[model samples]
Target: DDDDKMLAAEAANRDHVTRCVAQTGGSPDLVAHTAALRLYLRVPHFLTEWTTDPDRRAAVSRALALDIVSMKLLDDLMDDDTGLDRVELACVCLRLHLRALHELESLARDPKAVTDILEQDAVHLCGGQIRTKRSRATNLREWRAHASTYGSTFLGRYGALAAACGGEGQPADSVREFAEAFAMTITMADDLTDYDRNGERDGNLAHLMRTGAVAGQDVVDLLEELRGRALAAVAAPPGAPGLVPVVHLYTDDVLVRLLPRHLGEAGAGAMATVKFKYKGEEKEVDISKIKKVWRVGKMISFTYDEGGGKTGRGAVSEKDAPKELLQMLEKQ
Candidate 1:
């Protein structure tokens, strides 16, 4: 029965993401297809640490997935202009937000409380987006404060929902504290990774350091400070063992993406052929032929030797590239 339930939750989460987007005539590309769904898979896999009921897990999973899909729609809409219908996309976002709220309320002991939490966090997230666009932080303090309201609120919302769905021991207030800390650490990690592309932008942590708002070494130290704070938050009061691994999962993901101190471990071999998308076509080229790889916003562009002293250009959305291939190209 546990096995069937596990499979069932996976099926439910996948269908909800796939079917809901499809019915709305949303671009499959906008969904980022499997990448988005795989994130939802985290709900069941990690949420199980707090509660055992399959029904609760399934309900929480679907609710969280809906919220994620909803936020993702707005995230792309806000961050990058796309070919999708603006009004239709915004409407779909509203529909999914309401559905997620309804699902959460049904599972909560205090329905209105959950509504208030979700609605408030929604406003914080949207306001944070607008603030980031319309204003710039002049100092590291302001940037650190802004991190709490920006990308971190989504995880705080999830923490609240997890608390509401959990057994007697879990509380929203405590869980949210941990979640926000964890989210802030991740926000900094993203800023670090995006440094190469950010180029002295206000939102970038590395840029802030380069401009002397803080020393580069200090930024690295601050990341460690934030990471330590997040780990400590989860390890304290009520002590949820489940959330611990979630922290490590994201931390490890960052490590793999950011750390490439040495390549090939001093081995010798020809580089393999890699595939990339260019002008609506997917093409394969030798990894060694890639001259350069760079990203502007979500679009990745690269140049490769096109044989006979010629060069060719190719591009793809960040989400579209195969993870292994993307890493290989970026490393080269």
Candidate 2:
């Protein structure tokens, strides 16, 4: 049963991602890498599947492990008073990186043009009044503050990628752009996937949504908008070399497959009718009976009733729930 459950979960997750990727015409490498990245985050079950090839798997595992640590650090930072501010700054840097990557890849045939766009854009973007003023001297300080907390695990992995990509020198504005774009887009996707629970857990984005600092609807809208922008940017003249390959990998292969699989499985209608009694009550109520099922963040929200329709609202853990439930919901 354990193996069965694990297999089911894996299939479901893959299926979901596959559907999403179909829309984007994603590449196999991108699909594999992104799947590897997310699976590294949510479930450790599939690691062995990808890990069979010792050398390649080791490299992937190392990168994914760093990604996991960075995610956890980001989560922790969200809890601290000054964390979101730093995160916002990181987000800005990430956005710049994404834009740069797109432009560079679009103009890949012309290295000079790629370099010119990245240098000019990075400066313009950073020069705006809205940019962070953290000095280069303080950059390492910030990295040390959080990066080291993960026991330098992520740094080693990051170093590995750097080495593979060719050295300790500052990444080209284009490379930086790619990294930033990838980070922001993926982060935003994750945030949207777990929107309800994340809001409740951190009270950051949800609060912003409510206060009109940003609109909730805009989150989805923006995701679509960015997707379109990225697609258009990639398709246009004077592009980054092999940029379309990365885009295909992300949209068609990774995003397409992952989002639907996860979201579909996690929907409310798939839950089994759970019967239980609460505190001296003679009657049994199906746990799903009293609640209106809906998604908020990464959780499924519902109400628990003792008797007489007296209800208390709560959330179901997305990760903890059985994968079969999600599979059923996806079919629905």
Candidate 3:
């Protein structure tokens, strides 16, 4: 039932993305690419299942390439400060979808091999990024700590899926370790790509660094370390399964190039910053100050200004906020 629901949702979302792309004058290739991205975002765990249909997977890869590589073009247009906003989020979503599809292709080919490589690199990369510990043991521990902080959310979910697929007899612990590591790497890469924007927008990482959740230089250093680690890990003893090569080929040849080009041409360069000002106050409030913002069924809470020094409040639901803000927040 869950699978069925997911599939149905994916199909529906794919249709919506396709329609959106078409309405925006996106080419057939672009529309298909967008559709593929929507599928990946909706079902990231599909990688564990391993699809046998080469044609279907190939199509997905093509779409992913068309979406991801183009991301920088959008990045170039922005002020180099604000992270991905709504329009940018849509573009990133498409790019992530493409990457997820590539991940799925790799997992489908050889789950264990791909999982191992992802896990090892994840640790090495994350460890290098968090430089508190002096020894490898402390490094591993800190890596795990960061993983628990931000990596756990997505990795925990994906790792559970891998464990379930591996069954009880298999070493679920190892698989979970790898999955968590993979999740950490992915999340870190995402943050790295949007580091400037994240700092500008939410200042989340800035706060984390200030509080010692991560080191500033660690982020850049970790990326370089991961690049080397990925290369060495791929060439290591067990050797990546056939799927690993396939994923590499697709990532290098297709997905990386296509998406960035598309986004660049699409003028996804403009960016906007949003700050909430407290009513009757001289300053803007950080997003954390706002609480319990959500959409339940048809009702939505869009914006609320806790009147500073006043008893009353002015709240804006989805219906009241700027159409663009509402659209962007809703995507979250």
Candidate 4:
């Protein structure tokens, strides 16, 4: 039963992303980019069960994709041009919000009330400005306030999703809790990874570490604890059966990708080979050479060194190199 639900939800989320991007003449690259954001946001997995109604699923997925795209654009507007001009930023933002309004017309059983909440939350969170790096949250109150800015939307959507899924009555609170825990997880991970693994800390966890709210790998420790509770709260009673799988979202960090996970127990001397083109020439390489895999926007990198005086790097279809290998490696 768990396997069935997991596959169905996975397919549903990928389908939604594919169709949504196709309308904009997007590509596999775009799909990977959009997925990284959705994966981090940790919403699509839940939306499978939350927006189970056929039309709602489509609308919500489209809205989900648009939300990720628009949010990225907001960050980009402040940074240097990423050359995303191939797609008109203004048009996408308009479509994104308007479509969400149309589909979320019955939000929280009272559309206008929910709409007011959305506007107020948007203004409260950002007032439509790219955040200054120095403006990171330093403490609990700041964490709660800055988090509420974006938390309002996810929280509100959780209600709409719960209502649509017929899990609205008692599960509403649980649904909200699930979203809250997830938002916190996202923030914690962002703060933890925004710099080098050994680099400076600037987010709430840094303050929490120093302020006695938490201690010992504050963000790392806190996220693990929150991750477990979030999974249980969404999967068990007061939650839908399939929703448990929804909350199991996390980053595809190098460690998570190469070892300590699907590949962790992989036998020493285990050799996995993948074939792909390097600079328009076909070649095959041992998967072990891939020391680190990092994601940047749409590009997922595999940094490998063939133990020689010379070293090289290249890209491959997410399927051929990383995705399938990651799956195959972990399957062991």
The numbered model that scores best in TM-score is 1
lDDT against the true structure, per candidate, is: 0.65, 0.38, 0.41, 0.51
Best of the candidates, lDDT: 1
Report the Cα lDDT for residue 256, model 1. Answer: 49
| lDDT (Cα, tens digit) per residue for candidate 2, span 193-291 | 455544342322333344444433344444454455445543433333334444445544334543443334423333454332334443433434544
**Model 1 over residues 208-322: C-alpha lDDT tens digits?**
6556675444444555675666677677656756566667766656444542211223111234555676677878877567778877788767788988999998876777655
Q: Which stretches of candidate 1 lie over 4 Å from their true place?
A: 1-12, 33-48, 120-125, 195-200, 252-332
CA lDDT for candidate 4: 0.51
lDDT of 4 by residue, 1-332 (tens): 65564455455655554566556555555545555554523354454355445565545544444455556645554453545543544444445455545655543355464465456446545652224244766555565455554553444454444444332344555665666676666655554454444455554444444455543333344456667757765665545656544445452232243222212234222367667777888867777666656554454456567668557676665555545456533454
Clashing pairs in 4: 262-330
Error of 4 at 307 (Å): 41
Q: Model 2 Cα displacement at 80 (Å)?
A: 10
Q: Would you list the rank order by lDDT, best first?
A: 1, 4, 3, 2
TM-score of each: 0.65, 0.29, 0.30, 0.53
Question: Lowest lDDT 10-mer window, candidate 1?
Answer: 259-268
Q: Model 2, which residues run further than 4 Å from truth? A: 1-64, 67-172, 198-203, 216-221, 228-332
